[PDB]
Write an enzyme that holds these catalytic residues in place. Sequence first.
Site, PDB file in Angstrom:
ATOM      1  N   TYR A  57     -17.833  -1.135  22.884  1.00  0.00           N
ATOM      2  CA  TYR A  57     -17.587  -0.087  21.896  1.00  0.00           C
ATOM      3  C   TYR A  57     -18.188   1.254  22.332  1.00  0.00           C
ATOM      4  O   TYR A  57     -19.356   1.312  22.699  1.00  0.00           O
ATOM      5  CB  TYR A  57     -18.246  -0.536  20.600  1.00  0.00           C
ATOM      6  CG  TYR A  57     -17.845   0.117  19.308  1.00  0.00           C
ATOM      7  CD1 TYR A  57     -16.712  -0.307  18.631  1.00  0.00           C
ATOM      8  CD2 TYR A  57     -18.701   1.002  18.671  1.00  0.00           C
ATOM      9  CE1 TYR A  57     -16.408   0.173  17.370  1.00  0.00           C
ATOM     10  CE2 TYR A  57     -18.389   1.516  17.422  1.00  0.00           C
ATOM     11  CZ  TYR A  57     -17.226   1.122  16.783  1.00  0.00           C
ATOM     12  OH  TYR A  57     -16.918   1.607  15.515  1.00  0.00           O
ATOM     13  N   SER A 130     -20.320  -6.505  26.263  1.00  0.00           N
ATOM     14  CA  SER A 130     -20.623  -6.378  24.842  1.00  0.00           C
ATOM     15  C   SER A 130     -19.419  -6.825  24.002  1.00  0.00           C
ATOM     16  O   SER A 130     -18.997  -7.968  24.129  1.00  0.00           O
ATOM     17  CB  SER A 130     -21.118  -4.967  24.566  1.00  0.00           C
ATOM     18  OG  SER A 130     -21.860  -4.925  23.353  1.00  0.00           O
ATOM     19  N   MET A 131     -18.814  -5.930  23.196  1.00  0.00           N
ATOM     20  CA  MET A 131     -17.623  -6.276  22.431  1.00  0.00           C
ATOM     21  C   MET A 131     -16.458  -6.656  23.348  1.00  0.00           C
ATOM     22  O   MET A 131     -15.627  -7.475  22.985  1.00  0.00           O
ATOM     23  CB  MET A 131     -17.178  -5.140  21.522  1.00  0.00           C
ATOM     24  CG  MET A 131     -17.855  -5.208  20.215  1.00  0.00           C
ATOM     25  SD  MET A 131     -17.171  -3.963  19.071  1.00  0.00           S
ATOM     26  CE  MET A 131     -18.299  -4.203  17.717  1.00  0.00           C
ATOM     27  N   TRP A 155     -21.106  -9.598  22.680  1.00  0.00           N
ATOM     28  CA  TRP A 155     -21.351  -9.476  21.260  1.00  0.00           C
ATOM     29  C   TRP A 155     -20.086  -9.861  20.493  1.00  0.00           C
ATOM     30  O   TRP A 155     -18.984  -9.480  20.856  1.00  0.00           O
ATOM     31  CB  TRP A 155     -21.802  -8.038  20.985  1.00  0.00           C
ATOM     32  CG  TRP A 155     -22.006  -7.812  19.532  1.00  0.00           C
ATOM     33  CD1 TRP A 155     -23.167  -7.900  18.822  1.00  0.00           C
ATOM     34  CD2 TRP A 155     -20.961  -7.545  18.594  1.00  0.00           C
ATOM     35  NE1 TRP A 155     -22.913  -7.689  17.494  1.00  0.00           N
ATOM     36  CE2 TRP A 155     -21.568  -7.471  17.332  1.00  0.00           C
ATOM     37  CE3 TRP A 155     -19.577  -7.379  18.698  1.00  0.00           C
ATOM     38  CZ2 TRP A 155     -20.822  -7.221  16.191  1.00  0.00           C
ATOM     39  CZ3 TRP A 155     -18.840  -7.132  17.565  1.00  0.00           C
ATOM     40  CH2 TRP A 155     -19.461  -7.046  16.325  1.00  0.00           C
ATOM     41  N   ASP A 176     -32.216  -6.352  25.617  1.00  0.00           N
ATOM     42  CA  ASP A 176     -31.071  -5.812  24.916  1.00  0.00           C
ATOM     43  C   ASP A 176     -31.373  -5.644  23.432  1.00  0.00           C
ATOM     44  O   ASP A 176     -31.772  -6.597  22.774  1.00  0.00           O
ATOM     45  CB  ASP A 176     -29.886  -6.749  25.119  1.00  0.00           C
ATOM     46  CG  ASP A 176     -28.525  -6.167  24.786  1.00  0.00           C
ATOM     47  OD1 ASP A 176     -28.471  -5.344  23.832  1.00  0.00           O
ATOM     48  OD2 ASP A 176     -27.515  -6.575  25.472  1.00  0.00           O
ATOM     49  N   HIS A 207     -29.330  -3.118  27.506  1.00  0.00           N
ATOM     50  CA  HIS A 207     -27.974  -3.550  27.202  1.00  0.00           C
ATOM     51  C   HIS A 207     -26.991  -3.253  28.343  1.00  0.00           C
ATOM     52  O   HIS A 207     -25.960  -3.929  28.457  1.00  0.00           O
ATOM     53  CB  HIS A 207     -27.553  -2.900  25.882  1.00  0.00           C
ATOM     54  CG  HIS A 207     -26.201  -3.291  25.394  1.00  0.00           C
ATOM     55  ND1 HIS A 207     -25.812  -4.601  25.187  1.00  0.00           N
ATOM     56  CD2 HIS A 207     -25.147  -2.484  25.053  1.00  0.00           C
ATOM     57  CE1 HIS A 207     -24.563  -4.594  24.722  1.00  0.00           C
ATOM     58  NE2 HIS A 207     -24.121  -3.298  24.637  1.00  0.00           N
TER      59      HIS A 207
END
Length: 261
Positions: A57, A130-131, A155, A176, A207
Site C-alpha cells: 500500500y 506487505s499487502m 500483511w 517491522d 518493514h
Amino acid sequence: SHMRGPNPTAASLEASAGPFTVRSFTVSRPSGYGAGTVYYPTNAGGTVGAIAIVPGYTARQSSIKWWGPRLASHGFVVITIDTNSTLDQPESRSSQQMAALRQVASLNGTSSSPIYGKVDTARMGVMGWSMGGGGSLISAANNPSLKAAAPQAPWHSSTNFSSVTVPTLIFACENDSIAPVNSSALPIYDSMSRNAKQFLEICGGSHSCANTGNSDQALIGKKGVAWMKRFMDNDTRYSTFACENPNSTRVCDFRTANCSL
Ligand SMILES: [Mg+2]
C-alpha cells in the site's frame, strides 16, 4: 523436471547475478493492473517460468524492482507491477497479480513480444511486499497450480491461510512496526499445514528490509532464487539451498516444514 543453468553454489546464489543476461521492457497496454516491467533472460536455452511481484500500500515498482534482474538472471521471466491505485487492498492486489501473469502468458504467444516463446506458462510463481505479500498468499489459495510463493513482510486482514498447498517462503523483518512478525508473518506461517513452507526473519529489519537497496541481498536473493528454482523448476539441485537453515547471523528466527534437504 526443468533444470537450467550450472550446478548452484552458495557463492553463485549470493552474487549480484546468475548466469543469464537480463533485458527488460515496459508493458505497453497493461491488462487489469496499473503498469508493469518485464525482466527476462535473453539466453536461458529453454523456456522459463514466470513470477509476478506486487508492492505494498502506497508503494510502487521501485520498492520491489531489485528482484526483477536477480531472479531473471537465474532463469525466470519476472513482472513487477504498479497497481491500478496505490491504495488497492490485498484481494485487488491478488487479482492484479494474476492479471500480470495472464498478460505475460499472452505475450509469450505474441510474435512481436521480446518474450515470444521464452515462457513455460505452466510454471508460475507469486511474490510481493506487505499487502502485496498478502495478495500473493491469496493468489496461492485461489490458484493452487501456482508452483511457489515467496511474500515479504506480508500483511492481510486475516492470518488464516490453512488451505494453501503451494510451497511458501515467508520473509519477515524483525522490527517491522507495520506488519509485525508476531501478529502477521508468524501467524500466517503457522496457519499453513498442507505445504512445504519456510520462515526467515531478518535481524533488526524494518518493514522495508527485503526491498530494493536492502543490505541483505546476498542472503535474501540466495533464498528467493533457491526457493523458486527448487519449486517452480522442480530442480532438486537446489533442495539444500531452499530448505536449509542458512546459518546467518543476520537471521533472528528460522522455521521450515515439509521441506526435504
Ligand atoms: Mg501494505
